[PDB]
Amino acid sequence: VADYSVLYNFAPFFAFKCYGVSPTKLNDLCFTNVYADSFVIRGNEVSQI
Amino acid sequence: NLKPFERDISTEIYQAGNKPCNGVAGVNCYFPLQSYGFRPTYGVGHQPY
């Protein structure tokens, strides 16, 4: 059960950018599969990727 | 959602997240009114009609 309500709670500080989809209202959205990507990048380079 | 045959002129700051901005904008707050990219290089479908 993909709960993004906690998402605004833990780490809402720097950026919440959402690309291709609605930034909100996806909690009620139903879908097939979710992929999680984790990496450490420089703060200025977040717009480059 | 907009009603049929209705014209809306008031463009306020749109809150795109939990973060309350009230004229702060930034993350989770994007102003809805946005301009086209009018490039003559832009091909069919991106030229004015």
Swiss-Prot record, chain A:
It comes from the Viruses. Residues 42-44 are annotated as: Integrin-binding motif. Binds to host ACE2. RBD also interacts with the N-linked glycan on 'Asn-90' of ACE2. Cleavage of S generates a polybasic C-terminal sequence on S1 that binds to host Neuropilin-1 (NRP1) and Neuropilin-2 (NRP2) receptors. Interacts with host integrin alpha-5/beta-1 (ITGA5:ITGB1) and with ACE2 in complex with integrin alpha-5/beta-1 (ITGA5:ITGB1). May interact via cytoplasmic c-terminus with M protein. May interact (via N-terminus) with host bilirubin and biliverdin, thereby preventing antibody binding to the SARS-CoV-2 spike NTD via an allosteric mechanism. Attaches the virion to the cell membrane by interacting with host receptor, initiating the infection. The major receptor is host ACE2. When S2/S2' has been cleaved, binding to the receptor triggers direct fusion at the cell membrane. When S2/S2' has not been cleaved, binding to the receptor results in internalization of the virus by endocytosis using host TFRC and GRM2 and leading to fusion of the virion membrane with the host endosomal membrane. Alternatively, may use NRP1/NRP2 and integrin as entry receptors. This is Spike protein S1. It comes from Severe acute respiratory syndrome coronavirus 2. The lineage of its organism: Viruses, Riboviria, Orthornavirae, Pisuviricota, Pisoniviricetes. The gene is S. The chain holds residues 362 to 410 of 1273 of the full protein.
UniProtKB/Swiss-Prot annotation, chain B:
Changing residue 34 to R: In strain: Omicron/BA.1, Omicron/BA.2, Omicron/BA.2.12.1. Residues 1-49 are annotated as: Receptor-binding motif. Residues 1-31 are annotated as: Disordered. Changing residue 34 to Y: Reduced host ACE2-binding affinity in vitro. Disulfide bonds join 21-29. Attaches the virion to the cell membrane by interacting with host receptor, initiating the infection. The major receptor is host ACE2. When S2/S2' has been cleaved, binding to the receptor triggers direct fusion at the cell membrane. When S2/S2' has not been cleaved, binding to the receptor results in internalization of the virus by endocytosis using host TFRC and GRM2 and leading to fusion of the virion membrane with the host endosomal membrane. Alternatively, may use NRP1/NRP2 and integrin as entry receptors. Binds to host ACE2. RBD also interacts with the N-linked glycan on 'Asn-90' of ACE2. Cleavage of S generates a polybasic C-terminal sequence on S1 that binds to host Neuropilin-1 (NRP1) and Neuropilin-2 (NRP2) receptors. Interacts with host integrin alpha-5/beta-1 (ITGA5:ITGB1) and with ACE2 in complex with integrin alpha-5/beta-1 (ITGA5:ITGB1). May interact via cytoplasmic c-terminus with M protein. May interact (via N-terminus) with host bilirubin and biliverdin, thereby preventing antibody binding to the SARS-CoV-2 spike NTD via an allosteric mechanism. This is Spike protein S1. The chain holds residues 460 to 508 of 1273 of the full protein.
